[PDB]
Amino acid sequence: MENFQKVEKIGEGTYGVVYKARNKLTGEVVALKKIRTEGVPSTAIREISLLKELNHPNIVKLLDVIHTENKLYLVFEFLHQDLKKFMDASALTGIPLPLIKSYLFQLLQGLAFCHSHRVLHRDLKPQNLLINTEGAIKLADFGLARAFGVPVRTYTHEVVTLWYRAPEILLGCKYYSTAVDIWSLGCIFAEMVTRRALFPGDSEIDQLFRIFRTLGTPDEVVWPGVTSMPDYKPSFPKWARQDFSKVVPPLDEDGRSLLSQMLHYDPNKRISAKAALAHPFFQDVTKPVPHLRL
Ligand SMILES: CCN(CC)CCNC(=O)c1c(C)[nH]c(/C=C2\C(=O)Nc3ccc(F)cc32)c1C
């Protein structure tokens, strides 16, 4: 883009490539996301504007959309680090619980806001969560698989993480609900705590079976309707649920109780972002400042 000097390529998206870029007029530093070119739907750019009018301290601001010359550019505010990088950097000592807690609380606020506005993320993962020096965390790179839609790639030969995908998606449900984002955020919370991915599947079925081995193979008792879902097979192995205290030690009982509710199989039993904010886990929540090396 001639309006912009690329400083660097800071991420490889689901949709496209993200660049750190400077505006030659304003001198403002931004994140620039470029999307691959068929006639490049009209319908898409409509509901991108739905993302543009979202303003919340926990949602990364979308500054502009630019359709010119058969690529789509999304201009976003720039943040200095992503949670994936921060977790890797914190792997030795772990992220302090008060900071984990503030981050979870803020992400739930962000989700509560998005969801009350009928916007789903669908894509949540540590790479998509951005932090700053003042202790804020923000939802970014909304994946919307309507308002556009879903490829199997981003641009070139990049491998999509299934680790955060809700079981209803894996079982082939056509219609997502807001519950899919709470699932992903639950997986992220566990990972901050234990410093290991909770469900690191290497394929769709391995992802499913990893969830089953830990939470038990779902049945009609815990998840009415499950056996009727498009990708469900009666031939799935039957695993018993693991004791939950094995899962995220040493998280306290308030944390485990909240996590267990974010991880319910039935999208209808799964806690809402709004209700999650009222959980006793957050009674002592504060806003600590992260030690960030930029
Ligand atoms: C392994 C961790 N990371 C993945 C490659 C490596 C490092 N990458 C980083 O730290 C990083 C930084 C410093 N900014 C972003 C991305 C965005 C940003 O700032 N505003 C946005 C608005 C929308 C959006 F969709 C992405 C961004 C990343 C991934």
Please indicate if the annotation marks 110 as binding a ligand: no
| DSSP category for residue 134 | T
Query: Best mutation site among 19, 32, 73, 79 for ligand 1, i.e. most ligand atoms within 8 A of its Cβ?
Result: 79
| Cα gap 61→141, rounded to integer Å | 10
123 is a catalytic site residue: yes
| Cα gap 20→286, rounded to integer Å | 31
C-alpha pair distances (Å), 208 with each of 48, 54, 175, 221, 262: 31, 33, 18, 18, 17
| Cα gap 293→81, rounded to integer Å | 9
| Cα gap 175→242, rounded to integer Å | 29
Quick one: which H or E segment has residue 257?
helix 253-262
**Angle at alpha carbon of residue 244, lines to 265 and 115, rounded to 5°:** 40
> CB of 44 within 8 A of CB of 38?
no
Please indicate if the annotation marks 186 as binding a ligand: no
Chain position carrying tokens 């994936």: 84
For residue 10, which atom of ligand 1 is closest to its CA? 8
| Cα gap 148→232, rounded to integer Å | 27
Method used to determine the 3D structure = X-ray
Q: Using CB atoms within 10 A of its CB, is residue 132 exposed (0-12), middle (13-18) or buried (19+)?
A: middle
Task: Tell which residue, 102, 87, 162, 95, has the closest CA to residue 138.
Answer: 102
| Cα gap 196→164, rounded to integer Å | 13
- φ, ψ for residue 180 (rounded to 5)? -65, -35
Q: How far away, in angstroms, is 127 Cα from ligand 1 center?
A: 7
Ligand 1: lining residues by beta carbon, under 6 Å = 10-11, 18, 31, 33, 60, 76, 78-82, 84-85, 127, 130, 140-141
Task: Tell which residue, 223, 152, 217, 163, has the closest CA to residue 188.
Answer: 163
Could you give the domains of the chain?
1-80 (3.30.200.20), 81-292 (1.10.510.10)
| Cα gap 102→79, rounded to integer Å | 18
Please indicate if the annotation marks 125 as binding a ligand: yes
Q: Which value in Å is the resolution of this experimental model?
A: 2.0
Q: How far away, in angstroms, is 61 Cα from ligand 1 center?
A: 13
Question: Hey, how many other C-beta atoms are within 10 angstroms of the C-beta on 260?
Answer: 15
The interaxial angle of helices 97-116 and 179-194, nearest 10 deg, is: 170
